[PDB]
Paper text:
The most prominent mutations are in the spike protein, which mediates entry of the virus into cells by engaging with the angiotensin converting enzyme 2 ([name]) receptor. Despite being phylogenetically distinct, a common feature of both the UK and South African variants is the mutation of residue 501 in the RBD from Asn to Tyr ([name]). X-ray crystallography and cryo-electron microscopy (cryo-EM) structural studies have identified N501 as a key residue in the spike protein at the interface between RBD and [name] that is involved in critical contacts with several [name] residues. Mutations that emerge in the receptor binding domain (RBD) of the spike protein are especially of interest given their high potential to alter the kinetics and strength of the interaction of the virus with target cells.
To understand the structural effects of the [name] mutation on [name] binding, we expressed and purified spike (S) protein ectodomains with and without the [name] mutation in Expi293F cells, and conducted microscopy studies on the [name]–spike complexes. A cryo-EM structure of the spike protein ectodomain with the [name] mutation was obtained at an average resolution of approximately 2.8 Å. The structure shows no significant global changes in secondary or quaternary structure as a result of the mutation when compared to the previously published structure of the spike protein ectodomain with an Asn residue at position 501 (referred to here as the “unmutated” form). However, this mutation does not result in large structural changes, enabling important neutralization epitopes to be retained in the spike receptor binding domain.
Author numbering:
A (entry chain C): 447 to 496
B (entry chain A): 299 to 620, 641 to 675, 691 to 694
C (entry chain B): 14 to 69, 77 to 145, 153 to 176, 185 to 247, 257 to 298
Amino acid sequence: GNYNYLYRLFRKSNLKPFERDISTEIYQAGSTPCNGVEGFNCYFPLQSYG
Amino acid sequence: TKCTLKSFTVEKGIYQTSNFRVQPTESIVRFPNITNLCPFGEVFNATRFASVYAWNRKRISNCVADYSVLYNSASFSTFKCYGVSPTKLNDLCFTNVYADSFVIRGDEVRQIAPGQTGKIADYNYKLPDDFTGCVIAWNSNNLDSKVGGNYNYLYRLFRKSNLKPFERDISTEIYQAGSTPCNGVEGFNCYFPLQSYGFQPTYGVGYQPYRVVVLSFELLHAPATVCGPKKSTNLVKNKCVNFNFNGLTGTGVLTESNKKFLPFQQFGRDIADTTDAVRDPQTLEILDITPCSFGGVSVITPGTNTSNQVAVLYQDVNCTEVNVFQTRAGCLIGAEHVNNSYECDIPIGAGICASYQSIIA
Amino acid sequence: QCVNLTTRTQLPPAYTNSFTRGVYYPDKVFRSSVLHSTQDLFLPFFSNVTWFHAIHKRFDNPVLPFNDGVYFASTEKSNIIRGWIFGTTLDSKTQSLLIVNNATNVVIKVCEFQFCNDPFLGVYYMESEFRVYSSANNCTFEYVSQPFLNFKNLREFVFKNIDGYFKIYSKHTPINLVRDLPQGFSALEPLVDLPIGINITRFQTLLALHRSGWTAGAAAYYVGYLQPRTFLLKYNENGTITDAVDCALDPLSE
Ligand SMILES: *[C@@H]1O[C@H](CO)[C@@H](O[C@@H]2O[C@H](CO)[C@@H](O)[C@H](O)[C@H]2NC(C)=O)[C@H](O)[C@H]1NC(C)=O
Ligand SMILES: *[C@@H]1O[C@H](CO)[C@@H](O)[C@H](O)[C@H]1NC(C)=O
Ligand SMILES: *[C@@H]1O[C@H](CO)[C@@H](O)[C@H](O)[C@H]1NC(C)=O
Ligand SMILES: *[C@@H]1O[C@H](CO)[C@@H](O)[C@H](O)[C@H]1NC(C)=O
Ligand SMILES: *[C@@H]1O[C@H](CO)[C@@H](O)[C@H](O)[C@H]1NC(C)=O
Ligand SMILES: *[C@@H]1O[C@H](CO)[C@@H](O)[C@H](O)[C@H]1NC(C)=O
Ligand SMILES: *[C@@H]1O[C@H](CO)[C@@H](O)[C@H](O)[C@H]1NC(C)=O
Ligand SMILES: *[C@@H]1O[C@H](CO)[C@@H](O)[C@H](O)[C@H]1NC(C)=O
């Protein structure tokens, strides 16, 4: 498994053309705020291809 | 005016240069009452759930479904969708929903997935490779488990062939582990296919019973009866707003109407097929839609060799909605109205003319 | 339970004139004092509509092709006509639509029914006889609603199957004419749109027997067929359709 290539699974909004997002901030996927901490409906945006 | 005429010198006269717009201030979306809710309370929070070989299928149709309450609930330990998005469930519309409810072991919760191979996937509940919908699962150790062991939840352990997607098998045929003939008589190599779970409160996480509801969506040529909830805002009148009434959108001033609709009629049209009357879906009242006060902005000037003073005419615009004078042509700003009568130099209209002597009208 | 009715008197079906009936509102749009030309499934003016009787011994419950739409006219007293039978093969192989009005409410069901050859209801002189089906296997849609209902009542209905939508338009009219359809104008309001999504090519009226064998109460009904054409509809100040022009009837109305 080559896990060195990653894609942004989660984001709040669609990008502009020629826009790059490298920010490793947590995503809030539910009603509960995450406060930078993983948990219920709190996921890392970058997941690796298997 | 110099920009419009593409010249640095402007001859004496009146020049239509721009178009005054009353900009829309608010957005008013009025959608009717969110009634006839889908019965998710009798599926997720029923009295007794079914086994996985005989999973209960509830048909959700002809109702409006509030997936936001289901998604915002923190009791669910697993909320995984495979064909849709969780945040777009309240926006999309589907023909019908199949809700498959059962109880499994905590280690088999991952086995309800497309492309996943397991005993529950092959023999108890199978999902297709192009599955759409969401799988929801939550722990039920406080309810289903019994200190003497809950043996009521059975599961199929053996079958000759794998399941088709969304296929049930409640048959109790004795499996043939070997090649010996079995006529339904159990032997050394012939066992009953349905075994009972060992749900007890002393087991850890992974052997506790998990209640799973799987929602599958159908998008056939049948009408989309199942839709998400509609969040109607408050109604604002007498202002140029963007109205959205039951899918009919536009921009206008919504005032009270004296037109008495018949109860089956919703919108109103004039001779020229423009929507000038409408019914609010929340409260059954009739509203006139007056178009916002668009007008032409005209610039009245003498020659730039003479002077740089200008006057602005807003055509068909009242002077309270923009040296201010009200004419039948419109509102004239920057010209001093006088009681004397002269010959017409620059025509304004409706008997009004402008001249330079400052600019008088 | 099914019963063959074998005491009928043989008689050919009748035909009569539609006059200016069968008009309905094409849309949900209010229009005031304006003339609107519209292209839709409309009933032709002065057309040949099929006339069926229930008199004593006449009991007219055949199965007719639905075509593109059905205009049902009913010169009704004492509520003999109670509902309709909608489908393609009218057996358990396909899926059929049932519209019934019994003594309490109206029930609309889309299921796999096994229809009898002679389906009816019955009133004993108290309603205590239901013989319209023998089974109901796979239901997809159920809808219980408020009741729609010398000849004293005139009931006009338009049934349409467009894009999986079943439109029922209806109008109640107080008349005092004895035998035929009265001549006049009455635009049919839209009553209910049904999300059925099923194929329908045949229909059958449901009547009610009178028991005191069986006796047929005095009723008469009319079947007309909807054709794609243009009407010029007149909308008054109050917004009701008071007159119409059939653009393909004669050169004057053209
Ligand atoms: C009422 O009459 C109809 C018409 O004959 C009967 O329908 C037939 O019933 C026989 C009975 O075996 C079948 O073999 C035929 O195939 C049926 N014909 C059709 C067109 O379906 C009906 O059975 C009679 N009702 C009762 C209660 O006997
Ligand atoms: C049970 O589940 C239903 C799902 O619709 C929910 O509305 C209800 O509030 C739940 N019961 C409790 C006590 O939370
Ligand atoms: C819909 O909701 C509004 C909310 O104020 C209420 O007044 C009204 O009676 C409800 N029902 C209908 C049929 O409009
Ligand atoms: C209506 O049809 C019948 C037979 O189909 C025919 O005998 C009759 O003349 C027709 N009526 C008119 C007015 O044409
Ligand atoms: C509907 O039924 C008729 C006859 O029952 C058939 O000819 C037609 O093809 C059917 N239409 C569809 C879309 O199945
Ligand atoms: C009318 O039909 C409905 C549904 O079939 C039933 O619930 C009701 O009891 C019926 N009423 C009478 C008087 O038979
Ligand atoms: C329809 O009913 C028959 C018997 O009642 C049954 O075998 C069949 O599976 C049913 N089909 C559906 C789609 O419900
Ligand atoms: C329209 O309604 C008014 C009642 O407001 C009535 O007086 C008038 O006669 C009606 N006109 C028509 C043509 O129906």
